[model samples]
Target: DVDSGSKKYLSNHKGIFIHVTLEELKRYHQLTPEQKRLIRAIVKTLIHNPQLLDESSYLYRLLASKAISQFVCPLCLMPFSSSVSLKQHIRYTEHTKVCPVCKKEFTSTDSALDHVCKKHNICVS
Candidate 1:
């Protein structure tokens, strides 16, 4: 179900490498120690630097190789433009709230307002 939700939009892939192979809860546990560490690091980075989700980040390349990075979560390196949609992702607004339309991760109200004004000129017009 999650795969269906992801493939239709964010990426064209059939399924994530191991998402379906293991039980939902054990996916993390199935990883090697280094992978577990990487997972934790990724989560920490997500909490500390939400902007890492930006398509420009090298992290995207390290984790994705040639796979579709569209709709991938900067937090998990998983395809999820929805369910874990922009609305869901921005719930960490205290950390980072990215506007789906603007591609800006806002850390403050003033910055958010400014981001919209600067990035949404086409919509305003």
Candidate 2:
């Protein structure tokens, strides 16, 4: 189930959120073929469903579980559990300077955060 990308988690998941630094995503860009494929699946969902920018609940539903929310930020490319933390991360976090693409303007950015900033031509920062 861990390999399912929706139901399974690394198991070692510490309840603490480990937000991926910009460095981490840059490395994601250099992943191996298999890793790239997997990342592609993730990127495909986020980009195509640009509505997923800050929308964590929607993403939780898309992923059909909480596992994906643990390790991934539907937007700004980080990790978080609650919406407040996500909102702060998007607005104050150094790497996550992009506007909420989800258009939800949530106090929590995890799920409400989306890529709808396209309307502003900010282009996902």
Candidate 3:
């Protein structure tokens, strides 16, 4: 039943390609619940009305190339309108690194490694 979700929406040849794009996005990105919900809604809409999906659009071209580059967050797969916004998001959300051994948080990976070395006596090279 779960498998039919995409199948039900994919009624035509163009819809099949749209379904493939959705799967590709899922495969390469870490999508949040909100992002998944929004994607499902968009996919449903596009599949039902394939004519609304434009192949010449910038998004289509980007998806076709499969090279999202810096606009998308590698950690969370969230997209931004500009590199500035993407950088800010990464700085705010991704700069913090957590030490698995001590269950402590640090500002960066190097800081986390330092804490682990000093506190947990684990040296990672």
Candidate 4:
């Protein structure tokens, strides 16, 4: 009875794969402490299991895509090696919003809304 029930739930699904590289892994500064520990465990597993080095294996594909990917800024068209750098750039830059009625630029959305309400005498919902 146990064997018959256990066999019924067996799956034949071939799941999708995502490739990740060591360099890309290192660029993830925002990872939690637990994630860093898991990464170390993966490295240890690779060292112990040489059989996973086969080209057809998932681990092989993951390591193969070792090239670092870049994140680009839409405003300035600047490329950053990591998302952290892009976030920092956005935080420091004066990415202003434009007022529709007056065509004036403001550093914040609230200021633009105030300008539109006072100058244009329009109520914004």
Among these predictions, the greatest lDDT belongs to 3
Which parts of model 1 are misplaced by more than 4 Å? 1-22, 54-125
Q: How accurate is candidate 4 locally (lDDT)?
A: 0.53
What is the overall TM-score of model 2 with all chains considered together? 0.24
Q: What C-alpha lDDT does candidate 1 achieve relative to the native structure?
A: 0.49
Q: Assess candidate 2 and give its lDDT.
A: 0.51
Worst 10 residues of 1 by lDDT: 116-125
Which is the better candidate, 2 or 3, if ranked by TM-score? Answer: 3
Candidate closer to the true structure by lDDT (higher is better), 1 or 4: 4
| lDDT per residue as tens, model 3, 89-122 | 7566655376544356766756765775686464
Please, what are the lDDT tens digits per residue for candidate 2 over residues 25-69? Answer: 788668899986786687678768775666655444535433546
User: What are the RMSD figures for all models against the true structure?
Assistant: 17.5, 17.3, 16.3, 17.9
Error of 4 at 81 (Å): 38
Per-residue lDDT of model 1, residues 28-92, tens digit only: 67679998779777766776877656633544453573265344433233444454564355355
lDDT of each: 0.49, 0.51, 0.57, 0.53
TM-score of each candidate? 0.29, 0.24, 0.25, 0.25
Q: Write the per-residue lDDT of candidate 4 for residues 6-109, one digit (tens) a residue.
A: 64344535322235788875776578889868967876676687544442243233233323334544333345667788667656662546744345788785
Displacement of the residue 46 alpha carbon in candidate 3, Å? 0.6
Instruction: Provide the lowest-lDDT 10-residue window in model 3.
Output: 55-64
Ranked by lDDT, the better of candidates 3 and 4 is 3
